[PDB]
Design a binder for this molecule. Structure first.
Ligand SMILES: NC(=O)C1=CN([C@@H]2O[C@H](COP(=O)(O)OP(=O)(O)OC[C@H]3O[C@@H](n4cnc5c(N)ncnc54)[C@H](OP(=O)(O)O)[C@@H]3O)[C@@H](O)[C@H]2O)C=CC1
Ligand SMILES: CCc1nc(N)nc(N)c1C#CCc1cc(OC)ccc1OC
Length: 166
């Protein structure tokens, strides 16, 4: 029944798991976006249809895969899938794919996540979209580092990476 690729989550959330507000990001952290680009470069990005449209354009140097239940949905420079299994088919030969949100898409792929790249922002934003709860039993933190806080990046935040022990 198994897929061969590593399923990694890529997400940034606040102290209460908020990841979005009014179909956008509640914060603006250029430095954190650089870490995201650095980490995901050359790997497929899997994104919910809403997430993708908020971004608005294909992210260069990565396979953009959009998840939608719309069978007539198309976008140039991007791939479209309509299910977890169709993603696994498209990415069958990939080493590692990144589930890039948003919340519905995180929920979809949660039974399959092997590795978690999560930025935690030490602030409580007003929001309406939340990262799903996770049982970390049998996971281990393998990297942690404080983010750069300066004029362009006005919050305290940390990068964490957790690996499943399965
Ligand atoms: N801080 C962070 O790291 C991140 C924050 N965000 C934020 O999250 C928000 C977006 O999240 P959310 O509203 O949940 O939207 P999603 O990105 O999860 O997209 C939801 C869409 O995905 C498609 N979809 C959902 N379930 C399925 C399924 N089972 N099969 C096929 N397609 C499916 C549907 O598309 P369709 O309607 O076309 O059928 C649905 O409308 C935005 O605010 C964004 O800015 C997003 C990513 C990361
Ligand atoms: C907040 C940026 C971010 N960080 C982490 N660690 N994981 C994520 N999935 C995201 C995200 C996002 C959405 C987004 C991305 C983007 O360029 C990559 C541009 C705009 C975006 O939302 C409008």
């Amino acid at each position: 029944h198994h897929h061969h690729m590593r399923v990694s989550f890529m997400v940034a959330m606040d102290e209460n798991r908020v990841i979005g507000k009014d179909n956008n990001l509640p914060w603006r952290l250029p430095s954190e976006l650089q870490y995201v680009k650095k980490t995901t470069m050359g790997h497929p990005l899997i994104m919910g249809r809403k997430n993708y449209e908020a971004i608005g354009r294909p992210l260069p140097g990565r396979r953009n895969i959009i998840v939608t239940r719309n069978e007539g949905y198309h976008v140039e420079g991007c791939e479209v899938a309509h299910s977890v299994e169709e993603v696994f088919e498209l990415c069958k030969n990939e080493e590692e794919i990144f589930i890039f949100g948003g919340a519905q898409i995180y929920d979809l792929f949660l039974p399959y996540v092997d590795k978690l790249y999560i930025t935690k922002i030490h602030h409580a934003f007003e929001g309406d979209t939340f990262f799903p709860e996770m049982d970390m039993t049998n996971w281990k933190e393998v990297f942690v580092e404080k983010g750069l806080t300066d004029e362009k990046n006005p919050y305290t935040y940390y990068y964490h990476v957790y690996e499943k022990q399965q």
